[PDB]
Structure 1
Amino acid sequence: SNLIEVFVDGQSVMVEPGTTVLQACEKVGMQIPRFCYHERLSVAGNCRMCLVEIEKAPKVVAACAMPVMKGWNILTNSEKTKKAREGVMEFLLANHPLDCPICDQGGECDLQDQSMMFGSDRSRFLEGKRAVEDKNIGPLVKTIMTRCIQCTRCIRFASEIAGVDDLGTTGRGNDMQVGTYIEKMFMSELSGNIIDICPVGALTSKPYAFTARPWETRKTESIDVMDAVGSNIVVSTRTGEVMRILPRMHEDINEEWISDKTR
């Protein structure tokens, strides 16, 4: 074989050439924090949450995008890796709105959870925040774009999996806004999966809106019957009532997506 030897925190692991730093750390059971990386989307490398120290290298590398070289010792828990994560989380939470009680993502929020796990416990941001105009992309996806952290999972999903090319980023800098730039309605057959892959509450389910909350939901693993694909789903119920339907990962059927009829 042509496997190269790399190190995650001193532990040796044999990886294929072209393996990223994030995947090499995944092979020893360490999940590097991320916001823009998704293993079924193309690599973006712009949330900078996956920044990790390679030792004897005076610069952190973006683990989602950087291929491993032979002999790298990836320091997933070192001091400057943790400082990089805290700084990036501080910039993500600088302009992010204090909406966690009114946001449907709360309790199942990647930004909340890895702010708890990898960020600091307090704020130094003494300024006013930005506020973004909400968009109207249809009756399925509620859009609250102040919560957007510009990870571009929207655009990569709609371009690469849904094949739509109607989402994008307009503007530049801190005023860069994810949207359609026009009053355009993002109605694919797969348009509800941007609710799944949005790490924050910027894209939420408009039918599910405000009704439940993830810790009180019971998760029943079941099968779609809306077509003959047999998409594996989670029916999440609450007190004997069906709240919503999420995908289950089945690599050979529905990889982690469901159609909007199913959803």
Structure 2
Amino acid sequence: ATIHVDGKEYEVNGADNLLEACLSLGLDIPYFCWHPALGSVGACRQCAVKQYQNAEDTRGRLVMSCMTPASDGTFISIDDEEAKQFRESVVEWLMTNHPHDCPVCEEGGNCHLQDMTVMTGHSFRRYRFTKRTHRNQDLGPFISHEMNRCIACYRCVRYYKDYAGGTDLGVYGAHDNVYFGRPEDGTLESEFSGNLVEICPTGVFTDKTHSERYNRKWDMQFAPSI
């Protein structure tokens, strides 16, 4: 397939959506709800690009790059002013209720939400009202739960139920009181519940065994092991 991003022509795979095609080209589009292993649902509304009907077109339309196929002869723009404004607005809407928690949160320095807040360029707060608050649950000895940091990107439920086949983690509640967790306090029964700490782009699910002796990612000495 042939696509044109910001006036530059690229050859991609036509069976892919525009988000994974543009991320494979090295282009940067912010995203929360999409995962390569989980597919596209169009939930977080973060990956908005501006699509044009043809080569000569000035109006365009904000489309969802994870929900849009990278068909042949596509014309999109990432650095369009309206697209950038909407992506910053989506980050701002996510940050209206986010707790002032980065120093005492185990996802600090490893947080996808931090990376995409910085990458959209949103650093000024004009929201002056209250932030919603959630109680936490005990999820067992391995996963630490902090529902205040949730952005309702639905990655946890999608992975844990649709992918990993687990049955004890779900989404509850309503409009802006959506709660992601177990129906009651208890250990997460799945044998692959540890991948929630990497699936969750925020610090809702964290490695508790790491949290006992916590250090940030920049302070780690890493090796590739088996």
8 Å contact kept, 1:140–1:207: yes
What is the match of residue 205 of structure 1? 207
Separation in 2 of the partners of 1:185 and 1:44? 28
Q: Aligned partner of 2:4: which letter?
A: F
Q: Does 1:12 align with 2:9?
A: yes
The answer to whether the 8 A contact 1:85-1:119 is kept is no
Change (3 A) 1:27 1:212: closer
1:216 is the counterpart of 2:222: no
Q: CA separation in 2, counterparts of 1:122 and 1:175? A: 25
Higher helix share: 2
Name the residue aligned to 1:181: 183
Instruction: Indicate conservation of the 8 Å contact 2:168/2:189, yes or no.
Output: no
Give the SS at the match of 1:207: helix
Structure showing greater relative contact order (alpha-carbon pairs closer than 8 Å, 6 or more residues apart):
2
Q: Secondary structure at the match of 1:196?
A: helix
Q: Which amino acid aligns with 1:165?
A: T
Identity %: 37
Q: 1:143 aligns with which of 142, 145, 159?
A: 145
Give the letter for the 2:35 counterpart.
Answer: H
Aligned 1:103-182 pairs, distance under 5 A: 103-182=105-184
Tell me the amino acid that sits aligned with residue 168 of structure 1: G
Q: Distance in 2 between matches of 1:42 and 1:6?
A: 21
Name the structure 2 match of 1:64.
Answer: 66
Task: Check whether the contact 1:47–1:151 (CA below 8 A) recurs between aligned residues.
Answer: yes
2:95 alignment partner, SS class: helix
Larger fraction in strand: 1
**CA RMSD, Structure 1 to Structure 2 (Å):** 1.6
Partner of 2:202, secondary structure, is coil
Which amino acid in the other structure matches residue 139 of structure 2? I
DSSP 3-state at the match of 1:200:
coil
Further displaced range: 54-63 or 136-145 = 54-63
Q: In structure 1, how many angstroms separate the alpha carbons of the residues matched to 2:72 and 2:62?
A: 17
Contact 1:155/1:165, CA 8 A, preserved across alignment: no
TM-score with structure 2 setting the length: 0.91
The equivalences for 1:25-64 within 5 A come to 25-55=22-52, 56=57, 58-64=60-66
**Match of 1:213, as an amino acid?**
R
Using the TM superposition, give the Cα deviation of residue 220 of structure 1 relative to its aligned residue in structure 2, in angstroms.
Answer: 1.2
Q: Normalising by structure 1, report the TM-score.
A: 0.79
Code of the aligned partner of 2:145: T
* CA deviation profile, 1:35-67 (whole Å, cap 9, x unmatched): 111100132211111111113464311111211
Alignment of 1:236-251 (within 5 A): none
The residue number in structure 2 matching 1:255 is none
Residue 184 (structure 1) shift: 4.0
Counterpart CA distance in 2 for 1:82 and 1:177 is 29
Counterpart position of 2:102: 100
CA distance in 2, matches of 1:206, 1:169: 22
In structure 2, stretches of 5+ residues that fail to align are none
Whole-Å separation in 1 of the counterparts to 2:25 and 2:209: 39
The secondary structure found in structure 2 opposite 1:52 is strand
Shift of 1:107: 0.8
Give 1:199 shift: 0.6
Q: Secondary structure at the match of 1:173?
A: coil
How far did 1:144 drift?
0.4
- Unaligned runs of 5+ residues in structure 1 are 224-263
